[PDB]
Amino acid sequence: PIVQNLQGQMVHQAISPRTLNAWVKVVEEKAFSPEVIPMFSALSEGATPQDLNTMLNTVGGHQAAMQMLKETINEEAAEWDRLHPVHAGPIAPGQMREPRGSDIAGTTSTLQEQIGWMTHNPPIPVGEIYKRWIILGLNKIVRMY
Ligand SMILES: Cc1ccc(NC(=O)NCCSCc2ccc(CN(C)C)o2)cc1Cl
Ligand SMILES: [Cl-]
Numbered sequence: 001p002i003v004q005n006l007q008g009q010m011v012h013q014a015i016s017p018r019t020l021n022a023w024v025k026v027v028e029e030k031a032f033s034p035e036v037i038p039m040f041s042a043l044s045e046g047a048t049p050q051d052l053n054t055m056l057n058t059v060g061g062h063q064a065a066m067q068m069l070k071e072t073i074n075e076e077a078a079e080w081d082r083l084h085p086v087h088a089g090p091i092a093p094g095q096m097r098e099p100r101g102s103d104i105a106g107t108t109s110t111l112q113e114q115i116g117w118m119t120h121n122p123p124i125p126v127g128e129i130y131k132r133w134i135i136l137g138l139n140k141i142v143r144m145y
């Protein structure tokens, strides 16, 4: 995740193993319950897309639900691309590129790119956008029970 230190410096840290442990244990108990969503949010403050994928990777023990979640993510990514069809290059040299859907979902962007977006002034909040997609997916599943 990205944390803000006392001088206002944004600092990246790898995801905590204790956070992953808690997430797995949560999901063991509340997998198809509405509580899984606020628990996911509670455990992903400042998360990068890479962090979120690491979290999802740890609970990949149920195809039907994870398959549903991945389908929702792909749907939301396609929708992003429809609203933001990316350009061949950035506006000028030195500028970051605008993220595609797969950049937001962390499959075609590097951690360094994610950090660059998230620590931009103001932030290009790719972790929060991805979180929204994941939450839409989790909501589908709890309805799917
Ligand atoms: C969102 C999410 C929620 C949960 C999980 N994992 C798990 O549920 N593992 C335990 C498996 S339950 C077993 C199960 C399969 C089907 C049914 C219900 N049928 C009888 C309708 O009952 C992963 C994600 Cl990604
Ligand atoms: Cl990376």
Ligand SMILES: [Zn+2]
Pocket (backbone or CB within 6 Å): 087, 089, 090, 091
């Ligand atoms: Zn452009």
Ligand SMILES: [Zn+2]
Pocket (backbone or CB within 6 Å): 120
């Ligand atoms: Zn800028």
